[PDB]
Amino acid sequence: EPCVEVVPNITYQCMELNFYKIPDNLPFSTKNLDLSFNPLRHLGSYSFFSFPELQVLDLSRCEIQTIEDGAYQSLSHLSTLILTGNPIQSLALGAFSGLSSLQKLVAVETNLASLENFPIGHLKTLKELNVAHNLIQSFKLPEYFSNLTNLEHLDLSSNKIQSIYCTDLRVLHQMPLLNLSLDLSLNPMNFIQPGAFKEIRLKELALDTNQLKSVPDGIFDRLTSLQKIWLHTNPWDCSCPRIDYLSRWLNKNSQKEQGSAKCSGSGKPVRSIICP
Ligand SMILES: *[C@@H]1O[C@H](CO[C@H]2O[C@@H](C)[C@@H](O)[C@@H](O)[C@@H]2O)[C@@H](O[C@@H]2O[C@H](CO)[C@@H](O[C@@H]3O[C@H](CO)[C@@H](O)[C@H](O)[C@@H]3O)[C@H](O)[C@H]2NC(C)=O)[C@H](O)[C@H]1NC(C)=O
Ligand SMILES: *[C@@H]1O[C@H](CO[C@H]2O[C@@H](C)[C@@H](O)[C@@H](O)[C@@H]2O)[C@@H](O[C@@H]2O[C@H](CO)[C@@H](O)[C@H](O)[C@H]2NC(C)=O)[C@H](O)[C@H]1NC(C)=O
Ligand SMILES: *[C@@H]1O[C@H](CO)[C@@H](O[C@@H]2O[C@H](CO)[C@@H](O)[C@H](O)[C@H]2NC(C)=O)[C@H](O)[C@H]1NC(C)=O
């Protein structure tokens, strides 16, 4: 057997074994399958018919360019799907058909340019979507996000987002159950429009290591139950009264600040600024 048997009947590690096809020699009972670093290249319909009990499937760095309709149709119990580092160029509209239990979808560095085209609108069980390290230019969340009533973590870090506009979070405003962690850090973001966050419950908000010189007055005033926020490594303009709102807010909410937002040119912590 080429794969490593971690737990008999349950967990198999098939990493870097030059598989060009899904293995057919493993137990039907398998729950956890790691196929990372294999030249899989294309996933046809019913690729995982031998693995109906799968809960976790790792397809990281498998050179996958295309995923056909029903590629994972068999996988009614899959909770975690990992597609990190595949040069995906064709994702069929029914690519994720059958994934009735999916809670975590990891699509880091999958050549993703927009959420609009991304066929995940039927995955109502989804709790976490990780699309970090991609090519997304817009934070406008598509209408299908209203289907994702269990979403609690959205990672859009290391993308190509330059702005947050008011309309961007429109879909989320109608969703009271929401308790969302939102990572928008490591983006070339230099603009946040006034009123962009209106009373959403963002448990966590990361906007560090962007290109922000300022934020609108009152931008965070309507946030509900914010627990942690990252704002550091931005070129903050600490001239008064421009920095008045943000310095006041960070001072008051200092327990929530992770890391230290600092003034461009002086390095003084933004939370320590007091305008005359
Ligand atoms: C956002 O969701 C809606 C509906 O959500 C349902 O999704 C299913 C999979 C399941 O999770 C369930 O719990 C949700 O209520 C999507 O709109 C619906 O799309 C389906 C097609 O998959 C339509 O069903 C079809 O209906 C026609 C007749 O009307 C039949 O001939 C077909 O066989 C099939 O049953 C359904 O009508 C749509 N509902 C409405 C009111 O639009 C929507 O597509 C989705 N958004 C995205 C972009 O994914
Ligand atoms: C547990 O898995 C076995 C098959 O895997 C066995 O043999 C090795 C691969 C070994 O590493 C270890 O995983 C395990 O002992 C299942 O038995 C097989 O079931 C199929 C039908 O699905 C039969 O056709 C096979 O004859 C039979 N054994 C063989 C030789 O492969 C077994 O059903 C499964 N048990 C549970 C509780 O799910
Ligand atoms: C979002 O916040 C809500 C409100 O506190 C959390 O829901 C509660 O979670 C605790 C612990 O699991 C339970 O004791 C309460 O009964 C829950 N209340 C509800 C709404 O039924 C929720 O867990 C938070 N979400 C995240 C992702 O942390």
Swiss-Prot record:
Highly expressed in placenta, spleen and peripheral blood leukocytes. Detected in monocytes, macrophages, dendritic cells and several types of T-cells. Expressed in pancreatic cancer cells but not in normal pancreatic cells (at protein level). It comes from Homo sapiens. It is found in: Cell membrane; Early endosome; Cell projection, Ruffle. The TIR domain mediates interaction with NOX4. Disulfide bonds join 3-14. Transmembrane receptor that functions as a pattern recognition receptor recognizing pathogen- and damage-associated molecular patterns (PAMPs and DAMPs) to induce innate immune responses via downstream signaling pathways. At the plasma membrane, cooperates with LY96 to mediate the innate immune response to bacterial lipopolysaccharide (LPS). Also involved in LPS-independent inflammatory responses triggered by free fatty acids, such as palmitate, and Ni(2+). Mechanistically, acts via MYD88, TIRAP and TRAF6, leading to NF-kappa-B activation, cytokine secretion and the inflammatory response. Belongs to the Toll-like receptor family. Induction: By LPS in plasmacytoid dendritic cells. Ni(2+) may cross-link the two receptor monomers through specific histidines, triggering the formation of a dimer that structurally resembles that induced by LPS. This process may be the basis for the development of contact allergy to Ni(2+). A mouse model of contact allergy to Ni(2+) in which TLR4-deficient mice expresses human TLR4 has been proposed. Glycans are attached at residues 9, 147, 179. LRR repeats lie at residues 29-50, 53-74, 77-98, 101-122, 125-146, 150-173, 179-199. Likewise, mutants lacking two or more of the other N-glycosylation sites were deficient in interaction with LPS. The gene is TLR4. Belongs to the lipopolysaccharide (LPS) receptor, a multi-protein complex containing at least CD14, LY96 and TLR4. Binding to bacterial LPS leads to homodimerization. Interacts with LY96 via the extracellular domain. Interacts with MYD88. Interacts (via TIR domains) with TIRAP. Interacts with TICAM2. Interacts with NOX4. Interacts with CNPY3. Interacts with HSP90B1. The interaction with both CNPY3 and HSP90B1 is required for proper folding in the endoplasmic reticulum. Interacts with MAP3K21; this interaction leads to negative regulation of TLR4 signaling. (Microbial infection) In case of infection, interacts with uropathogenic E.coli protein TcpC. This is Toll-like receptor 4.
